[PDB]
Design a protein around this ligand. Structure first.
Ligand SMILES: CC(C)(C)c1ccc(C(=O)N[C@@H]2CCCN(c3ccc(C(N)=O)c(Nc4ccc(C(=O)N5CCOCC5)cc4)n3)C2)cc1
Length: 263
């Protein structure tokens, strides 16, 4: 689990994450890596370092792989699989690309496979969104930063009334009671499907977090994106049931997605 910093090469900056700057680098002089710098004071480190053991064992082709951590010195580092096309949200918005309705469904299938894997290991993401998904050189979408929101120290991210909390990806039981389950990740996956089919639009555009939370309470939802067929809309809409219990599992979702790409 522990990586010696002598076995790393720190290079170009990739951008900014929740805990600070993310850099590109090389591990053991051979492998491409993403080195996530955790700014001192941004994370509850002792709690993360224990869960990092469990996360090391989370291994799936549609999950961004955790390679290790550097914790003998501060600021600490999280070493991960390098995703050459970066952020899914920016990738959807890139006008250079012309996505076919088939490629959009394939992106949903990618995320769904990783999410079914996490569900199968009783591991919650807690912050599933296109901005928290990454794309590799092959155009394969993988889920990233699974279970990290738990260790964030900033209350603006952590409280369901904070200016940085992911309200637009949250079910009513999360907004009202902080009740996180596999069914709250299901809701977030439906919003993520809308993000893919709308080509990176911000959900509930012209609504504030308080108004979005109020729109949801009124039983209202995201409109059908025109690239989504009736069958694709039934899938993302099923994720948004008022009753967490009536929402599908990621196994039911994958089977439904596979059925519509056969059709
Ligand atoms: C300004 C432009 C060029 C539009 C831009 C577009 C996207 C972004 C971006 O992906 N930022 C994110 C946000 C989340 C945390 N960050 C992370 C976290 C983990 C990884 C990883 N596991 O490898 C990663 N990888 C890349 C991040 C950027 C690139 C890159 O050079 N590109 C992106 C595509 O167009 C060309 C330029 C490649 C890999 N980034 C940085 C940064 C800048």
């Amino acid at each position: 689990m522990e990586i010696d910093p002598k076995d790393l090469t720190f290079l170009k900056e990739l951008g900014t994450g929740q805990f600070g700057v993310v850099k590109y680098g090389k591990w053991r002089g051979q492998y491409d890596v993403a080195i996530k710098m955790i700014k001192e004071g941004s994370m509850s480190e002792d709690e993360f370092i224990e869960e990092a053991k469990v996360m090391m064992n989370l291994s799936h082709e549609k999950l961004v792989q955790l390679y290790g951590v550097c914790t003998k010195q501060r600021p600490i580092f999280i070493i991960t699989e390098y995703m050459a096309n970066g952020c899914l949200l920016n990738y959807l918005r890139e006008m250079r690309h012309r996505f076919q309705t088939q490629q959009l469904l394939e992106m949903c299938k990618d995320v769904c496979e990783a999410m079914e894997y996490l569900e199968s290991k009783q591991f919650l993401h807690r912050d599933l969104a296109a901005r928290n998904c990454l794309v590799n050189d092959q155009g394969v979408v993988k889920v990233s930063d699974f279970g990290l929101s738990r260790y964030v120290l900033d209350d603006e991210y952590t409280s369901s009334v904070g200016s940085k909390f992911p309200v637009r990806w949250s079910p009513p039981e999360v907004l009202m009671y902080s009740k996180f389950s596999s069914k709250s990740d299901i809701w977030a996956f439906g919003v993520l499907m809308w993000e893919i089919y709308s080509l990176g639009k911000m959900p509930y555009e012209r609504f504030t977090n308080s108004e979005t939370a109020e729109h949801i309470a009124q039983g209202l939802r995201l409109y059908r994106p025109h690239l989504a067929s009736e069958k694709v809309y039934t899938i993302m809409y099923s994720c948004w049931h008022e009753k967490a219990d009536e929402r599908p599992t990621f196994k039911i979702l994958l089977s439904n997605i596979l059925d519509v790409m056969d059709e």
